[PDB]
Design a protein around this ligand. Structure first.
Ligand SMILES: [Mg+2]
Ligand SMILES: [Mg+2]
Ligand SMILES: [Mg+2]
Ligand SMILES: [Mg+2]
Ligand SMILES: [Mg+2]
Ligand SMILES: [Mg+2]
Ligand SMILES: [Mg+2]
Ligand SMILES: [Mg+2]
Ligand SMILES: [Mg+2]
Ligand SMILES: [Mg+2]
Ligand SMILES: [Mg+2]
Ligand SMILES: [Mg+2]
Ligand SMILES: [Mg+2]
Ligand SMILES: [Mg+2]
Ligand SMILES: [Mg+2]
Ligand SMILES: [Mg+2]
Ligand SMILES: [Mg+2]
Ligand SMILES: [Mg+2]
Ligand SMILES: [Mg+2]
Ligand SMILES: [Mg+2]
Ligand SMILES: [Mg+2]
Ligand SMILES: [Mg+2]
Ligand SMILES: [Mg+2]
Ligand SMILES: [Mg+2]
Ligand SMILES: [Mg+2]
Ligand SMILES: [Mg+2]
Ligand SMILES: [Mg+2]
Ligand SMILES: [Mg+2]
Ligand SMILES: [Mg+2]
Ligand SMILES: [Mg+2]
Ligand SMILES: [Mg+2]
Ligand SMILES: [Mg+2]
Lengths: 112, 48, 120, 43
RNA sequence: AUGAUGAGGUUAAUAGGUUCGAGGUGGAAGCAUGGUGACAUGUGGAGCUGACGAAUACUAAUCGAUCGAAGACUUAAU
RNA sequence: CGCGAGCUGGGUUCAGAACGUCGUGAGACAGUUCGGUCCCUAUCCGUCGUGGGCGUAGGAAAUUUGAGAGGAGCUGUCCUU
RNA sequence: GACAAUGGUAGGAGAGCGUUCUAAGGGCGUUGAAGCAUGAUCGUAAGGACAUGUGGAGCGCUUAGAAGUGAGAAUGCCGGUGUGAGUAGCGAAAGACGGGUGAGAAUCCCGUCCACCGAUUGACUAAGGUUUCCAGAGGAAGGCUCGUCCGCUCUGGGUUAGU
RNA sequence: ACCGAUAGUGAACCAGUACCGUGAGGGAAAGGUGAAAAGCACCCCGGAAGGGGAGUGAAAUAGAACCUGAAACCGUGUGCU
RNA sequence: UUAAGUUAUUAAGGGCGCACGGUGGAUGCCUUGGCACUAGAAGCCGAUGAAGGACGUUACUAACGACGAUAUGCUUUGGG
């Protein structure tokens, strides 16, 4: 059985969040918490909050053993962007993309 | 000054193969708490 | 020596205000490079305190800022009087050291290595 | 550097604005043309 | 530049501190004497000294963790 | 008439002005004279350094062979004969 | 059944395929229409089917009409979306520490120290701006970072003249 | 044998309106839950957003950006390389 | 064993194929709104203060309609 959580429209950009999200996938659920507490990226308190949420949906909703779970899927999709402008020089604006992310981690124990 | 050609999806992904990030220290605190960063004293949720 | 990202006078003023506050509170939280450099400042300033003569009283006041400690029972000593009176009596047998640096995690706004420098 | 349009509440109301448009026939033409577009603010 | 390179990581002199130097500056403060004074002289090559040298475990190089071989066939001599 | 996305801009085809000359004139000369804004965050190739990966039929540490490639390579004067 | 022809641009001629609508006829659809997606199907071509998903109401076929009828290009127009690239930048400048606040503090508050302006970065007062002013409350967006703060947002207040 | 939302009035939407201009003047973009709001009571994580259940409904990848959701683009897996 | 010879295994990453997502709003269907007309009226008001507006008026009120201090309406005659 699998347990998932998502975080939709997180204001961290998708390229910046997929760095730290590559560090934790495939790894067991206990040590993935320890990686997300020690990397000093901006995304590390956000994926950790989502990994807490999917380990909680495992214990509560599906009654899994949260001690032995492994992070199967850990991906971040693109969300809707906020298109901002920026005045540079000589009356000439340039677009700034405030990108958002849908962060999704799923967790399981590998059994059916 | 400007790129004469666009970079492809293949050439872009070959460039950023070293655009990675490392796993940190991750040593246990033997007194109490969770994993601390190596050679560091803990502040929260640990006794180092 | 380290330049700490500042001018010759901005570094000098930063480094003796950081050495005074490590006499007031005896353990302060700074960054790692600013604690590597105030380490040699305050240890050379406890060396002047273990002497205790008038000639090195004048030299410890080259460095120390004019800060007044509110001690217990509402008594007030300066940081110059607290250097030759309390720290100088603690380390009168020890031949060095006088500080330690305990590393901590990065800050939130930076990847600045936080550090507690203590007075041992 | 000093730009154009240094504002003035008296001159703006006196070279534009209603009692000036109404004083000449060609300024009642600009009022009739803005009533015909449905323009919310005249003058 | 980064990282690489090199010296070390407690059985440790790696860096700092401390102690002693080297070199540098040129006679500290305080005190005494003399001068009405400004100042001189003595105390005294004095004090001070960032990177240099030596000594010293005083402080910090913690506990840890990761990676890493099992030796393919074929034929020929042996 | 190598080299300005390496540099200057004295020379010159810019707007000002003046002389000579020509034109009735506005102007003109390819005659002078004074003055006159030099944009670019390097994608690819190429170059100068520097790492990582893998291979080199076990894995390592250390010393090396040199297939090759590159650098160097100038010359005066004086004295003896 | 013989025989012959069949490179081709401007350009001429011919025969077609699809598209939307109309007319008549004949139909198909919640036992799932059109679309959409996939497939190893058929036709000489433009094209046509079928199957299975998705989809949740329409649409085929035959004949004949009508045309806003077929796009890859116009430094086309309008939308999205990349590339450059995690690159340039982050708009003159000195802060440091302690305490506090909180989900969270290099930035918020308080304190001390330091620094800067000081014929002014100090006070008034016009123009001009309109409510930004003041209290609590908040942290989505705005602030070139952060944010517990704000000229931001929410709620409630605030301007008194015989001279 | 008129248009179906880049069409048809600029405007199917609190349009000559945001907005632009000192002014005349110029001038947008933006329709679709379901039959019915029955618009998710409660539980869990979280500061909150968000989620995971449960529940409504024929359907909830119909959850208010809400009919279908095509490509560009971004991903995560893989079979062969 | 020693030679000599041959051929792999590697995928940091990449390619193709497949699968599953996300973004995005094409397409299908839909229509409040437009478009072109036909027929029948009518066309232009105002110093008795027009067209246009501005401020107001609902228990709570921003806007738009509606109506002005008798203000989110009043009276009356008829429908209902
Ligand atoms: Mg990559
Ligand atoms: Mg100075
Ligand atoms: Mg060139
Ligand atoms: Mg001229
Ligand atoms: Mg003449
Ligand atoms: Mg000049
Ligand atoms: Mg032919
Ligand atoms: Mg023809
Ligand atoms: Mg049904
Ligand atoms: Mg179906
Ligand atoms: Mg159709
Ligand atoms: Mg279908
Ligand atoms: Mg056409
Ligand atoms: Mg085009
Ligand atoms: Mg970088
Ligand atoms: Mg950066
Ligand atoms: Mg670049
Ligand atoms: Mg750079
Ligand atoms: Mg930079
Ligand atoms: Mg700034
Ligand atoms: Mg205020
Ligand atoms: Mg306030
Ligand atoms: Mg921010
Ligand atoms: Mg506040
Ligand atoms: Mg549509
Ligand atoms: Mg339209
Ligand atoms: Mg919620
Ligand atoms: Mg669907
Ligand atoms: Mg429907
Ligand atoms: Mg949809
Ligand atoms: Mg890989
Ligand atoms: Mg009359």
């Amino acid at each position: 059985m699998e347990a998932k959580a998502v975080a939709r429209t997180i204001r961290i950009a998708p390229r910046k969040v997929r760095l730290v999200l590559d560090l934790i996938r495939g790894k067991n659920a206990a040590e993935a918490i320890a990686i997300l507490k020690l990397t000093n990226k901006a995304s590390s308190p956000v994926i950790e909050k989502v990994l807490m949420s999917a380990l909680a949906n495992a214990e509560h909703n599906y009654d899994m053993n949260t001690d032995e779970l492994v992070v199967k899927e850990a991906y971040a999709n693109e969300g809707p962007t906020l298109k901002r402008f920026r005045p540079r020089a000589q009356g000439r604006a340039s677009a700034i993309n405030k990108r958002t992310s849908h962060i999704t981690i799923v967790v399981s124990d590998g059994k059916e | 000054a400007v790129p004469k050609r666009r970079t492809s999806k293949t050439r872009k992904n070959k460039r950023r193969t070293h655009f990675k990030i490392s796993v940190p220290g991750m040593t246990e605190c033997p007194n109490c708490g969770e994993y601390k960063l190596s050679h560091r004293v803990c502040k929260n949720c640990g006794s180092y | 020596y380290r330049k700490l990202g500042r001018t010759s006078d901005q570094r000098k003023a930063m480094l003796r205000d950081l050495a005074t506050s490590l006499i007031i509170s005896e353990r302060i939280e700074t960054t790692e490079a600013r604690a590597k450099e105030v380490r040699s400042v305050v240890e050379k300033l406890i060396t002047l305190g273990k002497k205790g003569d008038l000639a090195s009283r004048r030299n410890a006041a080259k460095t120390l800022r004019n800060v007044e400690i509110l001690n217990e029972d509402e008594t007030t000593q300066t940081a110059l009087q607290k250097l030759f009176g309390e720290i100088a009596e603690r380390y009168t047998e020890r031949q060095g050291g006088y500080t330690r640096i305990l590393k901590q995690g990065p800050r939130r706004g930076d990847g600045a290595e936080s550090v507690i420098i203590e007075l041992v | 550097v000093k730009r154009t349009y240094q504002p003035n509440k008296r001159k703006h109301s006196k070279v534009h604005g209603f009692r000036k448009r109404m004083s000449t026939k060609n300024g009642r033409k600009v009022l009739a043309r803005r009533r015909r577009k449905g323009r919310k603010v005249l003058s």
